[PDB]
Structures are given as structure tokens and as C-alpha cells.
Symmetry: none
Subunit: 226 residues, 2 copies
């Protein structure tokens, strides 16, 4: 299927959607693959890191054959012409919004579809929303402000529980410290390092970590330095 996606059928569908605050469900071919499904996969992974309240699910509809989930495609008025079709539910299989048929299925667009329609926000992997808010043009604030930002965020660092997020905050703190010490030259250096490392010998978990670092690194970019 896709990682962290829950594939639902006519018996599980409503009863599962009805247990979650929000659900985003991709109705598609029973054996989906291709750019759009990969984008929904990436979105499942990002969503799952970003929220506690959002079910990411798929329903595979088989037309001809001994039919699978055709009731569901019928209920939601989606068939071979519409796929993949993205629905967003809010606890009630009868109340939903459907991603406009003209919107490209990309991670970015799926993430905006959720934010446009729920209070949830799915940031970039590695980013910590709290940190971000206090970090814009960190690289242009005075050394003493920077030094202040470092002590506060280092406090939230140890108020955080999830390993992923604890690693993320440590990268933020490292970058604050480097950018405090080296100035903005740091960005390009760290970028080149992370990219050479990503384009080298490393695992599944390895390239994700490096991407999370890059996304965290991006927060510290400014349009002019001063």
C-alpha cells in the first residue's frame, strides 16, 4: 500500500473514519503506483510525523472482476475516470471535502489541502513549528539576541518527548550555534556537506535525516544578509 496509510474497505471504512478527528483518503486503483501515489506516500509519512489526529487511508476500487469496494466508489461518486480522488473527512463519512479534480497530487498540494480545510498543519519534515516561529531572520538578529534564542530553544529541547523531534531540535540548536559563530557563510557550507553526504553511501533512515537537516537549514536562510 503506502507506509502509514491504512487501506480501508467496505467493512472498515466508515467505522475507521468515524474514529479519527480528520481523515484524508485517497480513492484509487486497487494497485496504485506512480508519481501521485508516491506523493500521497510522502504525504502519509509527513502527516504522521506532524499530527496525532489525522488518519491517512486509501481505498482501492476494482471496477470489473469480482468487484472490490465498488460500494465505496459509488458512495463517493468516484470511478476509473476520477482516480486518484482525495477526500478529507472530519469524523463523519457523510461530511467531506474532495480535492478539486484540477489540483495536482503533490506532497505540497496535499499538505495545503489539509491546512485549508482543518486546523492541522503539516510542516516540512524536520521543522519544529515552535522553533520556526521564533527563528525568522535569525541570521540578521544581533549576537546577543541569537545567544538568547539559543538558551530558550535549548530549554524546549529537553521539554520534548519524541526522539525524532528531539533530534530535530538538536539540529536546530547546532545550526543556531554555527550561524551565531560563523555567520551566514555557514549556510552554503552546511548545504554542500549535507548534499555530498546525501549523494554518497547511506541508508533509508540516513537520507531522511539529511533531508530533515536540509529543511531545518532552510529556516535560517534570509533574502539579504545585514
Amino acid at each position: 500500500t503506502c507506509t502509514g496509510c491504512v487501506d480501508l474497505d467496505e467493512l472498515s471504512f466508515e467505522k475507521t473514519v468515524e474514529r479519527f478527528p480528520y481523515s484524508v483518503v485517497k480513492f484509487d486503483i486497487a494497485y496504485p503506483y506512480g508519481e501521485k501515489h508516491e506523493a500521497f506516500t510522502a504525504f502519509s509519512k509527513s502527516a504522521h510525523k506532524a499530527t496525532k489526529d489525522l488518519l491517512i487511508a486509501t481505498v482501492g476500487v476494482k471496477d470489473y472482476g469480482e468487484l472490490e469496494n465498488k460500494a465505496l466508489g459509488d458512495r463517493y461518486k468516484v470511478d476509473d475516470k476520477n482516480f486518484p480522488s482525495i477526500f478529507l473527512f472530519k469524523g463523519n463519512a457523510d461530511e467531506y471535502v474532495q480535492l478539486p479534480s484540477h489540483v495536482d497530487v503533490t506532497l505540497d498540494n496535499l499538505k495545503a489541502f489539509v491546512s485549508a480545510n482543518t486546523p492541522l498543519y503539516i510542516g516540512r519534515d524536520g521543522c519544529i513549528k515552535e522553533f520556526n516561529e521564533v527563528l525568522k531572520n535569525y541570521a540578521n538578529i544581533p549576537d546577543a539576541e541569537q545567544l538568547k534564542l539559543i538558551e530558550k530553544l535549548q530549554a524546549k529541547q529537553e521539554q520534548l518527548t519524541d526522539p525524532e523531534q528531539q533530534q530535530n531540535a538538536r539540529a536546530y540548536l547546532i545550526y543556531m550555534r554555527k550561524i551565531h559563530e560563523v555567520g551566514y557563510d555557514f549556510l552554503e557550507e552546511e548545504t554542500k556537506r549535507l548534499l555530498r553526504l546525501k549523494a554518497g553511501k547511506v541508508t533509508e533512515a540516513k537520507k531522511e535525516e539529511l533531508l530533515r537537516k536540509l529543511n531545518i537549514l532552510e529556516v535560517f536562510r534570509v533574502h539579504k544578509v545585514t
Copy 2:
């Protein structure tokens, strides 16, 4: 399987913690076979009976990127004695594991459930909302029977699930016959169905007769207290 939700390292805890109870079968990825088919039958049965029970599977089948190996490890299960069946009580921390000696069958899974939760997976055919008001039906006065007939006929008309619609017909038949003839109907209809069931019947016809017998059983009374004809 149908109605089983397959969960993985990302979806497991978060899904299990949204349902009051979850029964989870850990097994190889792409499971198959007789225990899997029995878990499948159980999923169908539980879904017909409750809305509070998640039925789920985790495919460990560890030979690759090791999907779900961490999950199997959290619960200390093993290629070595798959399947392992767990019951969770609303989070991924509170669970009971089905003893590895218990054959994984439909009956044992239902028992596991009723043994460990307030949930009840009823007998095939039964409609809980009917059974709730039918206890001792055969002994109550005619006018109460008649009111129950009117009430369950009204319920039947609102039923939206097709298996319950069909089962409800058998309840109404039995209520009306029992009203009309008395408790002797229970022997009459039992002999009729047991005769059929003792014939050469397919598995699907067998199931259909069992559902009628499970419904008729609702009407049996421990002692007949109401006068005959």
C-alpha cells in the same frame, strides 16, 4: 482480510489508540492459510456485531527492509510462532495475548474477546437490539407479545443492513408463530431446521440453517409459565 485493517510501524499505535478494543493478528506479510481464514471469519463476525472493535493485522514477514520488525519486537513476536494474536484495550500498551496453545479459530477468537472485554460478539443471525427485548417472549401475555411484534416490525422496517433485514424476518416469523401457537412452535421449528441441517448441505446452506437456529434459540425458555393454546 475483509474488514481487517493492516497496520504498520506508522499507523499501528495511532490506530489502536482510537478504538476501544482492537484484536491484532501478527503474522507474515501476505498471510494465507487456515488460521488467517479463521481470523478473516472473525473480522466479518465482529464487524457485524460491534462498532467498537478494530480488527487488524500486522505483516512482519521480516526478510527485506524488515517492515514491522520493530512492531513485532515491541510485542515480542517472532517468525517463530506466527500468528500471534493480541487484544488491546484502547491503547498499544494495555493488551492481552492469546495463549499460543489456543487454536486460532472463529469460536476462540470470539471467546478471547468476550473474556477480555465488555464486548460481545453474538451468534450468527442474532440481532442484539431484538434479543434485548425478547427474553422470555414465549411466556409473556399475548398483548405484550403483540406489542413486541409491532415494535420489532417497526424496527425491521428501519433496518439498513441487509443481513439484519433478513435475520429480522426470521425473528418476526418466530414471534408471530409463537404468539399464534405457543411454545410448541419451538419444538416444531427446531425439528424442521434440524431435519434440514442433518441433510447433505453445503457450507453456505449450513450457515443459513445455523442462523435460523441461533435466532430460534432466543425464544427458548427455561420453564414454560404461560398457559398452552
